[PDB]
Design a protein around this ligand. Sequence first.
Ligand SMILES: NS(=O)(=O)c1ccc(C(=O)NCc2c(F)cccc2F)cc1
Ligand SMILES: [Hg+2]
Ligand SMILES: [Zn+2]
Length: 258
Amino acid sequence: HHWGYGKHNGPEHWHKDFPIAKGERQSPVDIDTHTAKYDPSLKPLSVSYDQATSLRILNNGHAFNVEFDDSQDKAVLKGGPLDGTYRLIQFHFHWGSLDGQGSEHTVDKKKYAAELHLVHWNTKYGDFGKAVQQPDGLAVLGIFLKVGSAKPGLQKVVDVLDSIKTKGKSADFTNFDPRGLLPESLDYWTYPGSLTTPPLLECVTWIVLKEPISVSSEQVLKFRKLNFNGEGEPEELMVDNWRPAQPLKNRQIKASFK
Ligand SMILES: NS(=O)(=O)c1ccc(C(=O)NCc2c(F)cccc2F)cc1
Ligand SMILES: [Hg+2]
Ligand SMILES: [Zn+2]
């Protein structure tokens, strides 16, 4: 049936319907800090989210996405290893059933409690659908979440989760500022990869921030109360919706710092 994160339809089965799962540039990967190459020609990241217009938050059965209006250059990502402008279309998280797991990428094999993905698409391609048919169509900003103190900027997201408990449910979510989810430093690692969920298209330039943000135990607890199932079906808690790290193969992870 449809792919999932369970025993019978999880990551290890995806290859059957999406053969690209065993490709050459799959994500996520483990970031070996001692092997990453400091590249002094990498420009600083430019995050312009001052004009961001959030619209809706939705539970799609795999995670919850906060969608933005990408009809024009309102919230964009430029600089870093990117060429051209990339528009923010949505952000979502991957998290675990326990605090010691949840992130997709790992640093020196270390797993974080969750990982935030800010999905952007290259404006040169006209629309998101075209962008996903190109090796440089997407840019995803990956941010790690570690359990500690509450992140004020995340609370609005946490408060609306009750409204979208089950698959298919959505709630209007305007005036949310994504800048409140950013760590203080924009230092990062970057490597060419893919979507971490089917169809696993290899169209992504991954930019993983070095500094993680802190969220309270109660904040991530609320993520865990979401459901994979739709209303009226047997309850399956939405936890551990992350894909294990893939082989790096012939790729180099570059760092923007030393
Ligand atoms: N975890 S992650 O790598 O950042 C990521 C980001 C975006 C998407 C997505 O937009 N799905 C849409 C989509 C389809 F549903 C079908 C075909 C192409 C797509 F882009 C999936 C995974
Ligand atoms: Hg592609
Ligand atoms: Zn993701």
